[PDB]
Ligand binder design. Sequence first.
Ligand code: HEM
Length: 153
Amino acid sequence: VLSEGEWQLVLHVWAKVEADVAGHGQDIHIRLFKSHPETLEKYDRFKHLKTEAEMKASEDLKKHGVTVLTALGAILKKKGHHEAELKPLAQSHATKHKIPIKYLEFISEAIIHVLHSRHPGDFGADAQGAMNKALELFRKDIAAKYKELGYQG
Ligand code: HEM
């Protein structure tokens, strides 16, 4: 559970993300793929990408990042009351894409990295802590939904 103050820090920095969703999405995916190359294997439509420049130039990857961040943003804005938004995500990621919880941990780390790289003045220790809690809640709830569907994290 996050306090109201923690949710406000989360949404304050999220507003910065919303000023350039595509750009943030690209940086997050690139960071994810560079730090954890095994994750790229899960994307049949992106695994052909060989260099950082190719990744940045991919319209398809850029569009996907907007889809990803739009979904995450919709979840965060519910401040924990996110069952309706989270359920379909768990369904697809468990039963179609087969994304282990550890990979959600990897992308969470990428999100923190990119947000701190771009907005240090609005993403200090307390804001990082809040976002970490929000992403931990997201992962915890999706893991529970995974199990409900018969998929082990
Ligand atoms: C913040 C965490 C994530 C969010 C909010 C998210 C969101 C989404 C959304 C909204 C879609 C499109 C609809 C759907 O199929 O559910 C999608 C598709 C997909 N996601 Fe995720 N995702 C996340 C993390 C991951 C991770 C870490 C991976 C891989 C390691 C992954 C792999 C995929 C794949 C392979 C697709 C299908 C892409 C395509 O071929 O069109 N997702 N994701």
